[PDB]
Design a binder for this molecule. Sequence first.
Ligand code: HEC
Length: 104
Amino acid sequence: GDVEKGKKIFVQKCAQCHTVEKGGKHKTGPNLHGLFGRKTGQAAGFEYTDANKNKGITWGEDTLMEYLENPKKYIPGTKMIFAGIKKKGERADLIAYLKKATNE
Ligand code: HEC
């Protein structure tokens, strides 16, 4: 995917609730640094729902593609209030940006 387009999507749809930088603050949602290859619910010091904590999948391109299409369908009971990104291209670009930004 396109990292620059993904950053624009992230700022538009995600950044109000999430930081990506190493040591970045929790906001409404957890800091996302180090997400790739990590199980659900593992950001230190964030109070996850039992639903997010117990989902038990590993974050990566495949699981983010499914989650971000419809978060509540993938993790029923999640307190992430976000309807989803319908378009495959937009999700792919956003995920390309997250793979770069959350590993810097
Ligand atoms: C605030 C209104 C949110 C918006 C907009 C987005 N996210 Fe979110 N997210 C938020 C909360 C409160 C939580 C915790 C959910 C819970 O039930 O405890 C989350 C969770 C995520 C996760 C999972 C993190 C993990 O398992 O460690 C991811 C990967 C995530 N959120 C990504 C994400 C993206 C990419 C967004 C823009 C499309 C986005 N979120 C919007 C709050 C909010």
